Amino acid sequence: MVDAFLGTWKLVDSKNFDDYMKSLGVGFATRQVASMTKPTTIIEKNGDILTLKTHSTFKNTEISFKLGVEFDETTADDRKVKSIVTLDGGKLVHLQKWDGQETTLVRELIDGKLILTLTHGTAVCTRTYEKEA
Ligand SMILES: CCCCCCCCCC(=O)O
After folding, report:
1. Residue 104 lies in a domain
2. Residue 35 sits in which domain range?
3. Which atom of ligand 1 is nearest to the CA of 26?
4. Principal place where this protein is found?
């Protein structure tokens, strides 16, 4: 039951993204630009294959995956990670692993908004997306 996630979403609120980027080792100049960007996230499905696009004026990313199947991913900050996306309690949980480190990207629907929670180390960032029609 991934169907409620599908569509086009626009960032409307961000808390502590600088704290998350610093924890990942992102350089101050990239943090500047990223702090002022309002990405568009598009989530599409074709059968068992999900595609997640993140578009912005700064960086674009795209991944395609099947739920529960590991994949190789190159992140926006140029980390080469082993990724798995699963559905857990109605949340879309994206785990990235590299160099014995982990970060989670959890997406949940609350009151029709998409809440993305990013955790690395002690850093927790919350990003709120709203559906575009
Ligand atoms: C340039 C820093 C990149 C950090 C990793 C990707 C974070 C995604 C944020 C989002 O989709 O809203």
Report:
1. yes
2. 7-132
3. 2
4. cytoplasm
Please indicate, yes or no, if residue 69 is contained in any of the structural domains.
yes
Q: Is 116 near ligand 1, meaning CB less than 6 Å away?
A: yes
Cα–Cα distance for residue pair 94/13, rounded to 1 Å = 20
**In-domain check, residue 1:** no
In a domain, 106, yes or no: yes
Domain count, the chain: 1
Q: What is the CATH number of the domain that holds 73?
A: 2.40.128.20
How far apart are the C-alpha atoms of 7 and 131, rounded to whole Å? 7
Q: Which resolution in angstroms does this entry have?
A: 1.3
Mutate which of 22, 36, 58, 75 for ligand 1 pocket (most atoms within 8 A of beta carbon): 75
Question: DSSP for the chain?
Answer: --GGG-EEEEEEEEESHHHHHHHHT--HHHHHHHHT---EEEEEEETTEEEEEEE-SS--EEEEEETT--EEEE-TT--EEEEEEEEETTEEEEEEEETTEEEEEEEEEETTEEEEEEEETTEEEEEEEEEE-
